[PDB]
RNA sequence: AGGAGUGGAGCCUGCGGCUUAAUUUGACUCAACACGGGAAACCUCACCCGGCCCGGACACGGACAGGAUUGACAGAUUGAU
């Protein structure tokens, strides 16, 4: 997968901390990441790479994939995309 | 001297292909099976099968001496 | 030789939308819905085998999977080989089979000769 | 034990290798000591790969790598 | 292998529909928009609200 | 005690046998045999003949920006841009 795919999958992971999928290899493009043309196979195999390291936490369902973010996975996105900690994701917004 | 040592180290091994595998050979991939193992046969029971003891005498067995009954002679 | 009252020589230059009015309804509807992208490239292969063939010699056998190819009258004389699931079987196109499918000339099965019945 | 090695692996279905000469820009460029830029091969007139991305020059044609444009 | 593998037209037919929880293709209940297997419907029937009255 | 029958006939569909490159398969008294919601053109599809792909996470060593895989017109090769 190219850089504008593997980067752009990691961008919305830091935004809210969760990612869903379909377990649909053959899907043309992921519906959350329109205007990028990233297939569902790309985000599926990217999170398969991230789960074995321990940055995300997997849960399955009827058909869909679910992924949360661990504490040591926030820092792995913090340095891969170079963000300062003065901004926060959706952890400390309400209450 | 080392080529026989190359025969020696494999004889510590080709012997040891016999004490864990009885006669595990590789089947021939190139030549047909009715050609590589033409000469053999399959026995229904290794002890209670018939076998003609003089079916294929080699030419060396025309150079040895026989007995009519060894114990009684 | 003719076919619906017109000889093969007018069929060689019979146009695309006028030859369709001589066929039966499956083949007429098939020419109405169009010949697809991998069926234009077969006729081009048979042209490429025809005009490089020697003038006293039939062209070489050509291998296909296209069992749905209608035998057009511009496809007579060619040696096509249509598959049977196992082998490519050699087919020589005669002018009397110009409304059939290509896939009814490689039989797909061994015609059955029975043995002795076992325990029924 | 409880297996046979069987020596029956046949992967001999050879793939390609990317033959690159050492710094193929020297195949691309040729500069004399006065400073002339002699682009020995054609430049593709496409919108995506114009003025920087060079074509191929085969035995009978020009050939691109981005949009695979072809000439005679 | 781009105009290929997921190329074949799956626009109808038995193998363009699958169960929505099994992803299995056989014994399928398309009525009322259920789209479940006949086995996975029977597990989740009382959750959907299909009660067995008679 | 009866009624409709089935078993006879043609055909439709299951199941054995034979055949086959393959004729995928489970189930064999009631408690297998229009059952697997099983009415398969492709898909379903397991089976047969041929071919492409990795969709082999991650950890370690090498190749390593005198590069690692990738993609691609034409020609031959091919069922096949
Ligand atoms: Zn370009
Ligand atoms: Zn289901």
UniProtKB/Swiss-Prot annotation, chain A:
Processing after translation: Methylated by PRMT5. Methylation is necessary for its interaction with NPS1, its localization in the granular component (GC) region of the nucleolus, for the proper assembly of ribosomes, protein synthesis and optimal cell proliferation. Monoubiquitinated by ZNF598 when a ribosome has stalled during translation of poly(A) sequences, leading to preclude synthesis of a long poly-lysine tail and initiate the ribosome quality control (RQC) pathway to degrade the potentially detrimental aberrant nascent polypeptide. Deubiquitinated by OTUD3 and USP21, antagonizing ZNF598 activity. Deubiquitinated by OTUD1, antagonizing ZNF598 activity and stimulating formation of polysomes: deubiquitination by OTUD1 promotes stability and translation of a subset mRNAs with a high abundance of rare codons can limit the translation rate.
Top-rank lineage group of the source organism: Eukaryota
UniProt entry keywords in alphabetical sequence: Cytoplasm, Diamond-Blackfan anemia, Isopeptide bond, Methylation, Nucleus, Phosphoprotein, Ribonucleoprotein, Ribosomal protein, Ubl conjugation
Main location: cytoplasm
Biological process, per Gene Ontology: cytoplasmic translation; translation
Keyword Cytoplasm tagged: yes
GO molecular-function terms, A-Z: RNA binding; structural constituent of ribosome
GO annotation, cellular component aspect: cytoplasm; cytosol; cytosolic ribosome; cytosolic small ribosomal subunit; focal adhesion; membrane; nucleolus; nucleoplasm
Compartments it resides in: Cytoplasm; Nucleus, Nucleolus
Entry keyword annotation includes Calcium: no
Residues bearing the modification Phosphotyrosine: 10
Coiled-coil intervals: none
Encoding gene, per UniProt annotation: RPS10
From Swiss-Prot, chain B:
Coiled coil location: none
Subcellular location, record wording: Nucleus, Nucleolus
Family to which the UniProt record says this protein belongs: Belongs to the TRAFAC class translation factor GTPase superfamily. Bms1-like GTPase family. TSR1 subfamily.
Task performed by this protein: Required during maturation of the 40S ribosomal subunit in the nucleolus.
UniProt name for this protein: Pre-rRNA-processing protein TSR1 homolog
Annotated source species: Homo sapiens (Human)
Swiss-Prot record, chain C:
Coiled coil spans: none
Keyword presence, Cytoplasm: yes
Cross-link (Glycyl lysine isopeptide (Lys-Gly) (interchain with G-Cter in SUMO2)): 94
Bilayer-spanning residue ranges: none
Record's keyword terms, sorted: Acetylation, Cytoplasm, Isopeptide bond, Ribonucleoprotein, Ribosomal protein, Ubl conjugation
Cellular localisation: Cytoplasm
GO cellular component labels: cytoplasm; cytosol; cytosolic ribosome; cytosolic small ribosomal subunit; focal adhesion; membrane; nucleoplasm; nucleus
GO BP annotations, alphabetical order: cytoplasmic translation; liver regeneration; osteoblast differentiation; positive regulation of signal transduction by p53 class mediator; ribosomal small subunit assembly; ribosomal small subunit biogenesis; ribosomal small subunit export from nucleus; rRNA processing
A GO MF term: ubiquitin ligase inhibitor activity
Domain of life: Eukaryota
Family stated for the protein in its record: Belongs to the universal ribosomal protein uS19 family.
Subunit record text: Component of the small ribosomal subunit.
Functional summary from the UniProt entry: Component of the small ribosomal subunit. The ribosome is a large ribonucleoprotein complex responsible for the synthesis of proteins in the cell.
Protein name, entry field: Small ribosomal subunit protein uS19
Organism in which the protein naturally occurs: Homo sapiens
Gene that encodes the chain: RPS15
UniProtKB/Swiss-Prot annotation, chain E:
Alphabetized GO MF terms: structural constituent of ribosome; zinc ion binding
Pfam families linked: Ribosomal_S14
Location in the cell: Cytoplasm, Cytosol; Cytoplasm; Rough endoplasmic reticulum
GO cellular component, one term: cytoplasm
Positions carrying Omega-N-methylarginine: 10
Keyword Cytoplasm tagged: yes
Main location: cytoplasm
Residues noted as binding Zn(2+) in the record, renumbered to the chain: 19, 22, 37, 40
Signal sequence bounds: none
UniProt keyword terms in alphabetical order: Acetylation, Cytoplasm, Diamond-Blackfan anemia, Disease variant, Endoplasmic reticulum, Metal-binding, Methylation, Phosphoprotein, Ribonucleoprotein, Ribosomal protein, Zinc
InterPro entries named among the record's database cross-references: Ribosomal_uS14, Ribosomal_uS14_CS, RIbosomal_uS14_euk_arc, Ribosomal_uS14_sf
Cross-referenced Gene3D superfamilies: 30s Ribosomal Protein S14, Chain N (4.10.830.10)
Organism superkingdom: Eukaryota
Cofactor note: Binds 1 zinc ion per subunit.
Names of the cofactor(s): Zn(2+)
PROSITE patterns: RIBOSOMAL_S14
N6-acetyllysine sites (modified residues): 46
Residues modified as Phosphoserine: 7
Biological process according to GO: cytoplasmic translation; translation
Record's subunit section: Component of the 40S small ribosomal subunit.
Clinical condition linked: Diamond-Blackfan anemia 13: A form of Diamond-Blackfan anemia, a congenital non-regenerative hypoplastic anemia that usually presents early in infancy. Diamond-Blackfan anemia is characterized by a moderate to severe macrocytic anemia, erythroblastopenia, and an increased risk of malignancy. 30 to 40% of Diamond-Blackfan anemia patients present with short stature and congenital anomalies, the most frequent being craniofacial (Pierre-Robin syndrome and cleft palate), thumb and urogenital anomalies.
Name of the protein in question: Small ribosomal subunit protein uS14
Organism, scientific name: Homo sapiens
């Amino acid at each position: 997968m190219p850089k504008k795919n593997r980067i752009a999958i990691y961008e919305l992971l830091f935004k809210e901390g969760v990612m869903v999928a379909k377990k649909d290899v053959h899907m043309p493009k992921h519906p959350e990441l329109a205007d990028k043309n990233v297939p569902n196979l790309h985000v599926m195999k990217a999170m398969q790479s991230l789960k074995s390291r321990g940055y995300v936490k997997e849960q399955f369902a009827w058909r869909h994939f679910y992924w949360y973010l661990t504490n040591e996975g926030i820092q792995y996105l913090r340095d891969y995309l170079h963000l300062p900690p003065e901004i926060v994701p959706a952890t400390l917004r309400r209450s | 001297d080392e080529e026989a040592e190359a025969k020696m180290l494999e004889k510590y091994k080709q012997e040891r292909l016999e004490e864990m595998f009885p006669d595990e050979v590789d089947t021939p991939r190139d030549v047909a099976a009715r050609i590589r193992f033409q000469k053999y046969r399959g026995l229904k029971s290794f002890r209670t099968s018939p076998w003609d003891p003089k079916e294929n005498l080699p030419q060396d067995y025309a150079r040895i001496f026989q007995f009519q009954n060894f114990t009684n002679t | 030789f003719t076919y619906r009252g017109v000889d093969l020589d007018q069929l060689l230059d019979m146009s695309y939308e006028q030859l369709m009015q001589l066929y039966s309804a499956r083949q007429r509807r098939r020419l109405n819905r169009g010949l697809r992208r991998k069926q234009h490239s077969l006729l081009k292969r048979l042209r490429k085998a025809k005009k490089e063939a020697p003038p006293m010699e039939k062209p070489e056998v050509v291998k296909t999977h296209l069992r749905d190819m209608i035998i057009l009258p511009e496809m007579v004389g060619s040696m096509v080989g249509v598959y049977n699931g196992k082998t490519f079987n050699q087919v020589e196109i005669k002018p009397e089979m110009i409304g059939h499918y290509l896939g009814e000339f490689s039989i797909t099965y061994k015609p059955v000769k029975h043995g002795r019945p076992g325990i029924g | 034990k409880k297996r046979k090695k069987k020596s029956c692996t046949t992967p001999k279905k050879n793939k390609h290798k990317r033959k690159k000469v050492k710094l193929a820009v020297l195949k691309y460029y040729k500069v004399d000591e006065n400073g002339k830029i002699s682009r020995l091969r054609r430049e593709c007139p496409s919108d995506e790969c114009g003025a920087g991305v060079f074509m191929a020059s085969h035995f009978d044609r020009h050939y691109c790598g981005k949009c695979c444009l072809t000439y005679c | 292998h781009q105009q290929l593998y997921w190329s074949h037209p799956r626009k109808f037919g038995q193998g363009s529909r699958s169960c929505r929880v099994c992803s299995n293709r056989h014994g399928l209940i398309r009525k009322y928009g259920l789209n479940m297997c006949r086995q996975c419907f029977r597990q989740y029937a009382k959750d959907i609200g299909f009660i067995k009255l008679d």
